Design a protein around this nucleic acid. Structure first.
Ligand SMILES: OC[C@H]1O[C@@](CO)(O[C@H]2O[C@H](CO)[C@@H](O)[C@H](O)[C@H]2O)[C@@H](O)[C@@H]1O
Ligand SMILES: OC[C@H]1O[C@@](CO)(O[C@H]2O[C@H](CO)[C@@H](O)[C@H](O)[C@H]2O)[C@@H](O)[C@@H]1O
Ligand SMILES: [Mg+2]
Length: 580
DNA sequence: GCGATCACG
DNA sequence: CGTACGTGATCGCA
């Protein structure tokens, strides 16, 4: 059953045809400055395996790789593109990426290797990467014979599956989504990841020392209030101290003991001083372990930069995710944590950080898709949406809206985007289901368009079996027909939320593509560093700030045309912290 | 490995 | 009749 191929000792013309399935294997999960263990090429002339040191040293092969007119079909082209960037080699002409194709066809399949993608089309003549390389620590690159056949089988699968995948994407009206959106975006994310973000390690270490002292102080205070020393991080021990020694009320338990989540502690705070200290300890410990020590662990010792990897084929809604490190969840909500951002600085002298963010893109998207007259008018007047929602549901004028009213109206708006339910809103606001139901009823009386939309999208999910986004991203919801209330409700909330969060993802992704095109046309040095769901962070010479202030918001606001305007705010400064 | 926890939009 | 939507990293413990 073995697959025939040529284990070449050198590159030949036959291997450089204008169309081929290409495999540039990088086994390390984190591909930054990582080894390329082998190369496979499958084209009209046959199947070939090439040793990396050989192929990458061949001028003809390198030229072929960078020739945009020589088309390549691959799986996870970003991985190869980045690994090649670290070697100073440009990869061009990728016309088809099987990973992105599989992802668009069905995000829920969780495709993360050629074998999983091929299985979708009943093609199984290729092994899963885990089977070949192993997992965790027992992982390793096989001997050449085994490695070579595997890479060739992967290239062969890609060669065979391109057409079937493209045909189905076409039937789904997702052909442009792959070719004009996700694939071009992949190249942009590759540049962003490769550029990396500079870190002021001296700043982080200083913060780490100050946090260590404060943690010591709070730690001693906790032992003092508990009447003894114990492992504050030990659930078993903390549980005994709080709910047994100190007799605090037990409101929530886990599959092993008592729950001490912030949500629980906040309600226990009034009963004992030790609680606020535990919450504070939690806050500092989180910053220290995850954002100081953790971050320092992945900073490149030579350049002092961090190179995240944006997983473009993971989320069920079309969003990106970020890892090692995750640069999409750096603190900002609480001032003490926000300081962490002072450690993220420009990569060059006299450059600055520029951040642009969409204002209420999810609710604006909702106004558009639901075609709700009241909601669309609200955004056309660029009103404070939470104050406006409070005015409508509580039947009062703007001057009569109290802070508590805006807060609750805001919670209602979050629930609306998440997939509203009386139980969900009730838990969030700490009110009764009946009271929550009333808020929801009032909301729908004021936004009948949204109500009709939520009713219709759930019905559509049942009829078609999936929901879609503005640019035709898809998410199947088989549980929408479940006869189990909890299971079905999960699916219903997904039907309501996915088109909103997903369309917002579509919009910013297109904005990124449009932005890079504009930056190149203007030959600006400014470039993207990060994307945080509804915001874009760039760095650029101080001399380019004025032009960026006009260019970035415009490009983001014009990415797509909706029934309501899109609004973008922006800030810039010496550090990410200051870009506010 | 996995549940609890908490960081972000 | 009971979960708010979407993610990732760290730590304690089986
Ligand atoms: O290269 C990113 C791409 O690879 C997948 C597997 O096909 O994920 C791998 O790489 C990630 C980044 O290092 C890891 O977080 C993940 O654990 C590893 O399997 C895809 O999911 C992703 O799109
Ligand atoms: O009472 C109708 C109302 O209930 C929802 C759930 O909030 O859907 C339920 O009723 C539908 C029939 O009207 C079913 O198709 C659906 O499976 C069931 O959960 C809303 O979508 C609907 O407006
Ligand atoms: Mg914003």
């Amino acid at each position: 059953a073995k697959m025939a191929f040529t284990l070449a000792d050198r590159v030949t013309e036959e291997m450089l045809a204008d169309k081929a399935a290409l495999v540039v294997e990088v086994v390390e999960e984190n591909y930054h400055d990582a080894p390329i263990v082998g190369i496979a090429v499958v084209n009209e002339h046959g199947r070939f395996f090439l040793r990396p040191e050989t192929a990458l040293a061949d001028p003809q092969f390198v030229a072929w790789l960078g020739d945009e007119t020589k088309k390549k079909s691959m799986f996870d082209s970003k991985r190869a593109a980045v690994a090649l960037k670290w070697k100073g080699i440009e990869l061009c002409g990728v016309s088809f990426d099987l990973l992105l194709a599989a992802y668009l066809l069905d995000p829920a399949q969780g495709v993360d290797d050629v074998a999983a993608a091929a299985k979708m089309k009943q093609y199984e003549a290729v092994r899963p990467d885990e089977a070949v390389y192993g997992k965790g620590a027992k992982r390793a690159v096989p001997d050449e014979p085994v490695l070579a056949e595997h890479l060739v089988r992967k290239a062969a699968a890609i060669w065979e599956l391109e057409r079937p995948f493209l045909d189905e994407l076409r039937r789904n009206e997702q052909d442009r989504l792959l070719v004009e959106l996700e694939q071009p975006l992949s190249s942009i994310l590759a540049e962003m990841e490769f550029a990396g973000v500079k870190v002021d390690t001296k700043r982080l270490e200083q913060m780490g020392k100050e946090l260590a002292e404060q943690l010591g102080t709070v730690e001693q205070r906790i032992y003092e209030l508990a009447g003894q020393e114990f492992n504050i991080n030990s659930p078993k021990q903390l549980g005994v101290i709080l709910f047994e020694k100190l007799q605090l009320p037990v409101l929530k338990k886990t599959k092993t003991g008592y729950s001490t989540s912030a949500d629980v502690l906040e309600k226990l705070a009034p009963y004992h001083e030790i609680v606020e200290n535990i919450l504070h300890y939690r806050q500092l410990g989180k910053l220290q372990s995850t954002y100081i020590e953790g971050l320092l662990k992945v900073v490149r010792p030579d350049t002092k930069k961090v190179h995240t990897i944006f997983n473009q084929a993971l989320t069920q809604t079309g969003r990106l995710s970020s890892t090692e490190p995750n640069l999409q969840n750096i603190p900002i909500r609480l001032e003490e944590g926000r300081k962490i951002r002072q450690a993220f600085v420009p990569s060059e002298s006299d450059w600055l950080i520029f951040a642009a963010d969409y204002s209420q893109i999810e609710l604006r998207v909702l106004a558009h898709i639901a075609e709700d007259d009241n909601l669309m008018e609200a955004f056309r007047r660029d009103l404070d949406i939470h104050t406006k929602t409070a005015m409508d549901i509580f039947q009062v004028s703007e001057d009569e809206v109290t802070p508590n009213m805006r807060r609750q109206a805001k919670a209602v708006n979050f629930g609306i985007v998440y997939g509203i339910s009386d139980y969900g809103l009730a838990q969030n606001l700490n009110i009764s289901r009946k009271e929550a139901a009333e808020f929801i009823e009032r909301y729908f009386e004021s936004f009948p368009g949204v109500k009709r939309y939520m009713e219709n999208i759930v019905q559509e999910a049942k009829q078609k079996g999936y929901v879609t986004t503005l640019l035709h991203r898809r998410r199947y919801l088989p549980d929408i027909t479940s006869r189990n209330f909890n299971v079905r409700s999960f699916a219903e909330r997904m039907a309501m939320n996915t088109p909103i969060q997903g369309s917002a993802a579509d919009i910013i992704k297109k904005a990124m593509i449009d932005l890079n095109a504009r930056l190149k046309e203007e030959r600006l040095q400014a470039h993207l560093l990060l994307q945080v769901h509804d915001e874009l962070i760039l760095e650029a010479p101080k001399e380019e700030m004025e032009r960026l202030c006009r260019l970035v918001p415009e490009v983001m606001e014009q990415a797509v045309t909706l029934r309501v305007p899109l609004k973008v705010d922006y800030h810039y400064g010496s550090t990410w912290y200051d870009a506010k």
